[PDB]
Design an enzyme around this catalytic site. Structure first.
Site, PDB file in Angstrom:
ATOM      1  N   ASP A   1      36.953  47.153  43.752  1.00  0.00           N
ATOM      2  CA  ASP A   1      37.821  46.399  43.912  1.00  0.00           C
ATOM      3  C   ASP A   1      39.841  47.218  44.563  1.00  0.00           C
ATOM      4  O   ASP A   1      40.671  47.130  44.239  1.00  0.00           O
ATOM      5  CB  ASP A   1      38.762  45.985  43.183  1.00  0.00           C
ATOM      6  CG  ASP A   1      39.941  44.643  43.314  1.00  0.00           C
ATOM      7  OD1 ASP A   1      39.988  44.642  44.551  1.00  0.00           O
ATOM      8  OD2 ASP A   1      40.735  44.338  42.691  1.00  0.00           O
TER       9      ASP A   1
ATOM     10  N   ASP B   1      35.206  42.520  45.579  1.00  0.00           N
ATOM     11  CA  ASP B   1      36.439  41.660  45.767  1.00  0.00           C
ATOM     12  C   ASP B   1      37.105  41.810  47.202  1.00  0.00           C
ATOM     13  O   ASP B   1      36.972  43.329  47.970  1.00  0.00           O
ATOM     14  CB  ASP B   1      38.021  42.133  44.679  1.00  0.00           C
ATOM     15  CG  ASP B   1      38.872  41.104  44.430  1.00  0.00           C
ATOM     16  OD1 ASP B   1      39.184  40.000  45.766  1.00  0.00           O
ATOM     17  OD2 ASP B   1      40.578  41.395  44.329  1.00  0.00           O
ATOM     18  N   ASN B   2      37.798  41.152  47.469  1.00  0.00           N
ATOM     19  CA  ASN B   2      38.229  41.115  48.919  1.00  0.00           C
ATOM     20  C   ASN B   2      37.338  41.329  50.860  1.00  0.00           C
ATOM     21  O   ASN B   2      37.688  41.992  50.944  1.00  0.00           O
ATOM     22  CB  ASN B   2      39.197  42.255  48.781  1.00  0.00           C
ATOM     23  CG  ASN B   2      40.445  42.137  47.787  1.00  0.00           C
ATOM     24  OD1 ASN B   2      40.894  42.723  47.207  1.00  0.00           O
ATOM     25  ND2 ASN B   2      41.107  40.921  47.998  1.00  0.00           N
TER      26      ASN B   2
ATOM     27  N   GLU C   1      46.378  32.150  47.616  1.00  0.00           N
ATOM     28  CA  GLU C   1      48.327  31.882  48.473  1.00  0.00           C
ATOM     29  C   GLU C   1      48.436  32.698  49.234  1.00  0.00           C
ATOM     30  O   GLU C   1      49.301  31.933  50.144  1.00  0.00           O
ATOM     31  CB  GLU C   1      48.740  31.116  46.989  1.00  0.00           C
ATOM     32  CG  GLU C   1      50.025  30.446  47.855  1.00  0.00           C
ATOM     33  CD  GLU C   1      49.651  29.613  48.350  1.00  0.00           C
ATOM     34  OE1 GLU C   1      49.252  28.391  47.816  1.00  0.00           O
ATOM     35  OE2 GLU C   1      50.322  28.755  49.190  1.00  0.00           O
TER      36      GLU C   1
HETATM   37  N1  LIG Z   1      38.607  55.995  45.724  1.00  0.00           N
HETATM   38  C1  LIG Z   1      39.337  55.638  45.190  1.00  0.00           C
HETATM   39  N2  LIG Z   1      39.214  55.969  43.785  1.00  0.00           N
HETATM   40  C2  LIG Z   1      39.335  55.546  42.576  1.00  0.00           C
HETATM   41  N3  LIG Z   1      40.525  54.530  42.891  1.00  0.00           N
HETATM   42  C3  LIG Z   1      40.925  54.439  44.091  1.00  0.00           C
HETATM   43  C4  LIG Z   1      40.459  54.783  44.830  1.00  0.00           C
HETATM   44  N4  LIG Z   1      41.104  53.766  46.376  1.00  0.00           N
HETATM   45  C5  LIG Z   1      41.947  53.078  46.298  1.00  0.00           C
HETATM   46  N5  LIG Z   1      41.814  53.096  44.932  1.00  0.00           N
HETATM   47  C6  LIG Z   1      43.248  53.047  43.811  1.00  0.00           C
HETATM   48  O1  LIG Z   1      42.388  50.791  43.714  1.00  0.00           O
HETATM   49  C7  LIG Z   1      43.660  50.379  43.258  1.00  0.00           C
HETATM   50  C8  LIG Z   1      43.362  49.254  44.298  1.00  0.00           C
HETATM   51  S1  LIG Z   1      44.229  47.390  43.320  1.00  0.00           S
HETATM   52  C9  LIG Z   1      42.909  47.408  42.011  1.00  0.00           C
HETATM   53  C10 LIG Z   1      43.492  45.454  41.210  1.00  0.00           C
HETATM   54  C11 LIG Z   1      43.634  45.802  39.712  1.00  0.00           C
HETATM   55  N6  LIG Z   1      41.455  46.066  39.934  1.00  0.00           N
HETATM   56  C12 LIG Z   1      43.454  44.369  39.380  1.00  0.00           C
HETATM   57  O2  LIG Z   1      42.766  42.917  40.048  1.00  0.00           O
HETATM   58  O3  LIG Z   1      43.620  44.067  38.328  1.00  0.00           O
HETATM   59  C13 LIG Z   1      44.688  50.839  44.242  1.00  0.00           C
HETATM   60  O4  LIG Z   1      45.352  51.141  42.717  1.00  0.00           O
HETATM   61  C14 LIG Z   1      44.029  52.159  43.804  1.00  0.00           C
HETATM   62  O5  LIG Z   1      45.061  52.965  43.442  1.00  0.00           O
HETATM   63 CA   LIG Z   2      42.005  42.857  44.860  1.00  0.00          CA
END
Ligand SMILES: Nc1ncnc2c1ncn2[C@@H]1O[C@H](CSCC[C@H](N)C(=O)O)[C@@H](O)[C@H]1O
Ligand SMILES: [Ca+2]
Length: 212
Positions: free
Chosen positions: A138, A166-167, A196
């Site tokens: 994610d 995800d996504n 939403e």
């Molecule tokens: N290469 C990478 N390695 C580790 N984290 C990363 C990354 N690229 C983006 N991210 C992190 O991944 C997150 C995506 S949002 C994740 C939401 C969380 N997993 C949940 O649903 O509760 C962000 O905070 C971002 O800082």
């Molecule tokens: Ca997400």
């Protein structure tokens, strides 16, 4: 006073400490009625809950912790002795997630590793890791496909390892889907989930031509 700090305060002020479900409902409440934030949410969570229960993992890797919602969501279902590792490149977020786990009472189940997935994944052998039972993707969508291959080449995937991304539709991870859906080494299944509202950072580049 960042938004991630505000979410943490609301949890510390409304949730029953040591009650992960209460923590989740506090985050869902605040992020549906005050400030939207990029946590999976309860609807996706219910898919995640079923995947964990149906596949009974012992060692789980999370790519992308943010505030810890999905880590709390998964950690709260794991059996004694089971571990969750969550990789997060943002240090501010990792700290928020750490407090979220502490408040939920799941710090013993989770280990936050600060850094980028592409640099940390090759290190997992030095964390007493052989192979993984489950992996939740994610983080940055540009990284689903290269991290997956990285996990393969690193020998971290076993026969039956579950990947949950995800996504994949919104905003989309079409190269990643094309890879796992088309590969004989992955038996894939898609789980629709209504959404939403979602906001993602984009941008526009202006480039004024100055001559050859
Ligand atoms: N290469 C990478 N390695 C580790 N984290 C990363 C990354 N690229 C983006 N991210 C992190 O991944 C997150 C995506 S949002 C994740 C939401 C969380 N997993 C949940 O649903 O509760 C962000 O905070 C971002 O800082
Ligand atoms: Ca997400």
């Amino acid at each position: 006073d960042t938004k991630e700090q505000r979410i943490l305060r609301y949890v510390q002020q409304h949730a029953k400490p040591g009650d992960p479900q209460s923590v989740l409902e506090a985050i869902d409440t605040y992020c549906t009625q005050k400030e939207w934030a990029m946590n999976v949410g309860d609807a996706k969570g219910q898919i995640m809950d079923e995947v964990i229960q149906e596949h009974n993992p012992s060692l789980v890797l999370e790519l992308g912790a943010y505030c810890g919602y999905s880590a709390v969501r998964m950690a709260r279902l794991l059996s004694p002795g089971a571990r969750l590792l969550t990789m997060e490149k943002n240090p501010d977020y990792a700290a928020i997630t750490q407090q979220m786990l502490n408040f939920a009472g799941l710090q013993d189940k989770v280990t936050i590793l600060i850094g980028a997935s592409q640099d940390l994944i090759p290190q997992l052998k030095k964390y007493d890791v052989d192979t993984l039972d489950m992996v939740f993707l994610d983080h940055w969508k540009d990284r689903y496909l290269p991290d997956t291959i990285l996990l393969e080449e690193c020998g971290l995937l076993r026969k039956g390892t579950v990947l949950l991304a995800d996504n994949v539709i919104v905003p989309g991870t079409p190269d990643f889907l094309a890879y796992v859906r088309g590969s004989s080494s992955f038996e894939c299944t898609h789980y629709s989930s209504y959404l939403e509202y979602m906001k993602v950072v984009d941008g526009l580049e202006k480039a004024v031509y100055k001559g050859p």
